[PDB]
């Protein structure tokens with residue numbers, strides 16, 4: 001719900017943060033920033049220069 | 050070989066004609082007449098689904 005009042009239980013750290021364009025929670029965003037990945041599945045035509 | 054030749058930014062020593070990448074294959078040549086260093090980029094290829 002938009003109210004997000006659960007009787008004193010604060011879930012702001014686990015629920016999506018709408019401020020970020022990825023809509024990930026603060027904890028999920030932290031987890032993604034901690035893991036380093038170079039072998040991306042993205043198109044890679046931006047090297048050779 | 051087969052590939053696209055481009056102007057290189059590599060500085061070859063007077064005794065070096067070829068360069069190697071991180072996987073020990075050819076990635077640059079010195080033109081035997083102009084002494085310009087050229088980068089070699091393999092021609093684009095990939096899978097077809």
Ligand SMILES: *[C@@H]1O[C@H](CO)[C@@H](O[C@@H]2O[C@H](CO)[C@@H](O[C@@H]3O[C@H](CO)[C@@H](O)[C@H](O)[C@@H]3O)[C@H](O)[C@H]2NC(C)=O)[C@H](O)[C@H]1NC(C)=O
Nearest residue numbers: 003004005006007008009010011012013014017025026027
């Ligand atoms: C649920 O918990 C989070 C995290 O504890 C609460 O957010 C936090 O709220 C406090 C007070 O509003 C923020 O501190 C203030 O930050 C501003 C930043 O400009 C600063 O000027 C103030 O002096 C003060 O330090 C804190 O930064 C903020 N943290 C996060 C991660 O949002 C949230 O309000 C809690 N919600 C409920 C319903 O209890």
Ligand SMILES: *[C@@H]1O[C@H](CO)[C@@H](O)[C@H](O)[C@H]1NC(C)=O
Nearest residue numbers: 066079080081082083084085
């Ligand atoms: C070959 O002759 C041309 C004449 O313009 C000169 O520019 C070039 O450097 C020469 N190459 C060698 C390897 O002597």
